[PDB]
Amino acid sequence: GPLPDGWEQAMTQDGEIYYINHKNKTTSWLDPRL
């Protein structure tokens, strides 16, 4: 996965590959890069 700013996508048990950015200071669900 090629992230926008380079921020991490992780598999949570909820069944979501989440995107969180320390530059964004926020937790977003789906790939922002799409």
Partner: peptide, 12 residues
């Protein structure tokens, strides 16, 4: 819905 809070990132 809300995902996990603003957090440093998880792998397992």
């Amino acid at each position: 819905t809300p995902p996990p809070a603003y957090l440093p990132p998880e792998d397992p």
